[PDB]
């Protein structure tokens, strides 16, 4: 039908900054354009319908402008809660088509991670698998290097990490790295988690002795 | 046997409008051109905060009445506010010559 | 700590619309004062179910 | 204000027929147009619209495989997507299409979305392990299929400092999830239990995490 | 058209201001004419915006202060305020009255010009029952019904079937 | 309709704004359509009242007095009075011009929508001579004539008599 | 009518606002309906003159002078000027918006009432192709074409020739 071309794809701005998201239709859609806000693991919330008209209960910092092809969503003063994927949708004709999306993340002051290390529980050890878990807690920015060590030996491709979505209050992240034994785990003693982050002066190591 | 009909929208909207030929015409959709709501607050005009004087009026404030001591004037204001209790003016009786004219000229600084 | 374009002795008004009936005495870029109780403009059609 | 609730299999095998149901409470199913919207990865895609009286409309890229129906007695709205493949692995949303206004026709009320996976792989219950301990303690929801897993603390009582991580697809094709909570170290002398629900395998387990 | 020959409106027609109700072997139901509804909104939005946006007001402080020996110019100030009040209340009120008439007349035109497009295509193949409806003298399938809606109807191929009926 | 196709008006039609002149074996004469005349009055009375009642004027004393050393504010007072004079003379005059157009257009609509109700019921049974008249191809008695007037006319029972004529 | 059923306007029709394009054995070409064009101008000139002439302004000197101790009445003078400015800008702008709508609606009526005079005379002798045209089922010479234009067309003498076609 009508192709909705959205720009930018990703966006990172501070609290108080002016944010502009541009949507483009492949043909003239008059003013039949909607803007949605999708928070993580939730259904899209209607912000603006009819290109410019504001939805009841939505903060006035959100605004819409445009007619025909070129449309613009504007967040005048960005807030920590504005972390979401934003979508434009035409309803000029069928099928209704959405834009690909614009992910907006909140920029804040640098915060160093709190590092925690978790040994595999003696319950998991009874089934022939050992999982060592490292936790980086409440940090910004999202990027961090997490390297595993069994002695002084650096570990290769037997670890997986998962990052939480940006906290809607203080704009921080949480990362959990998982190192998966049992015969290989019983072989070694020290278990270190090396954490490299731009907020830290030098890498942080949290380790334990088996027992 | 086969049929096609032409019609128009109806809903349970109870909104009435007045035309030049007809009063109280119930319509499906409408807009109010009149603004009948206020926030009930004395806000910053043009982004600039007002000069509030409380128990003092302009005469009491500008002359420095002893009852107007605990009052601090900013660098700028968009308008001046006096209350119904703004009774503190000239503590020694007499005429403030061109008082209203000074008030008008001090209104925004 | 609110912000306004039109200020009234009984409270600030923020519109948008060309007419208001809050108060005749106003400071700023204000809607014109009228004595109307309603100025409703029909957009939809005559409602007959 | 109106509630919409999606229900379905969660797991459906390739070439089969997907059957989803939107349970509506707060308004009549016969009085409104109802829409299905799915997002794969990819952005939002509009499946189609259906009304009791009448004449449905479906997306040209799906028309041959999609069917919608309305159950007036149970107040329900159904979707039938036939001959499904891996491309149909999406979060499916049921939404109400509001009556014509000056806007006029826009989706305001949505369901909370239901995840559907298209795979020949079998359903598997998770094994829950404690991550023993300001102190940090957690739960490892390990080896499960398919998505999702709901994790709460102290039967939903503990909300403060809870970080439930997005799941990771392991080498086996199974899922691993961690859920952590940071508590005062002085407040351990005070039971901490994680409640783990995995719907498709019917696995309901509680786990006391002790130092 | 509205309350004229077409008696009432449909609460069943949910997704548009003007449209059609059909009935054949394949089924029945309400279908909103999107194109005409969209234009109607686009024109009335322009009307609402024109009444709103053309009011460009100057920065003014209505309030004034005059002493006990300045009552004449105080009453001159009141005459200026009461003068503007009367002018604005009268013009705003009548503008509303005149525009609401035009808006309801505009909706009447759109419903009439939609009936007189269906009638304009069909002629002999369907009888005007009145009330906005056309009782077909022949089989009109969902494609036949949609061909009238978009304005690409073929008249001659049903007239012979209509003649015997 | 008025001076359009219907050439002139009837001084003979005494008791209404719009109506009918019939002619058959039983007799002839003018008959005013009361229902449409009554509505027309009811709508135009609302128009006249709306222009009148929406003027709600403040208690004001236009007169002011200024001495020989107050000519500037005297001329300011004159500017206020001459300003209101020009605004009111212009708006009142145009309002009259615009409303009179709408009123005469309204009467045109009512006469047209009355012709296009008689034509809409008759079809083949009477020929349109123009000039607002319908020459019946059959016997139309006083009951037949009144059946057209109230809008309960039976078409098919005269068409065969009309076909031969 | 304008952009309604008649798709576009003619740059070829040079000497009038509304008219006709014919085509027969004797030739073809555009011909402007002078009478309807002349009336249209005569009515719109009256509209333009009415908006202009009804403004009868008083002799006024807007300028005033006030010293450093007369700022209150200086601001009262500004309120009077800014008050008239807002009233006049708003009324003048809307008047233009409302009159332009009425003028373009007036042109639509004239084009429609010209089509519905040709259609009203012809009936069976020509088929409505749409787009404002009538395809004659018979020989319509320059006298036949001119008989439609002035409104003195004879219907029955071509119907039998039209029946076979
Ligand atoms: C300023 O504050 C108040 C005015 O509100 C004055 O207090 C009253 O003054 C009046 C005289 O106008 C007395 O009749 C009352 O007895 C006083 N007490 C009241 C009414 O509360 C006060 O005198 C003023 N002081 C100065 C320095 O200006």
UniProtKB/TrEMBL annotation, chains E, F, G:
Highest taxon of the lineage: Viruses
Disulfide bonding pattern of the chain: 140-144
Localization (cell): Host apical cell membrane; Virion membrane
Physiological role: Binds to sialic acid-containing receptors on the cell surface, bringing about the attachment of the virus particle to the cell. This attachment induces virion internalization either through clathrin-dependent endocytosis or through clathrin- and caveolin-independent pathway. Plays a major role in the determination of host range restriction and virulence. Class I viral fusion protein. Responsible for penetration of the virus into the cell cytoplasm by mediating the fusion of the membrane of the endocytosed virus particle with the endosomal membrane. Binds to sialic acid-containing receptors on the cell surface, bringing about the attachment of the virus particle to the cell. This attachment induces virion internalization of about two third of the virus particles through clathrin-dependent endocytosis and about one third through a clathrin- and caveolin-independent pathway. Plays a major role in the determination of host range restriction and virulence. Class I viral fusion protein.
Similarity comment: Belongs to the influenza viruses hemagglutinin family.
Record-given protein name: Hemagglutinin
Subunit structure: Homotrimer of disulfide-linked HA1-HA2. Interacts with human CACNA1C.
Organism: Influenza A virus
Full-protein interval shown: 349 to 513 of 566
Gene expressing this chain: HA
Post-translational changes noted in the entry: In natural infection, inactive HA is matured into HA1 and HA2 outside the cell by one or more trypsin-like, arginine-specific endoprotease secreted by the bronchial epithelial cells. One identified protease that may be involved in this process is secreted in lungs by club cells.
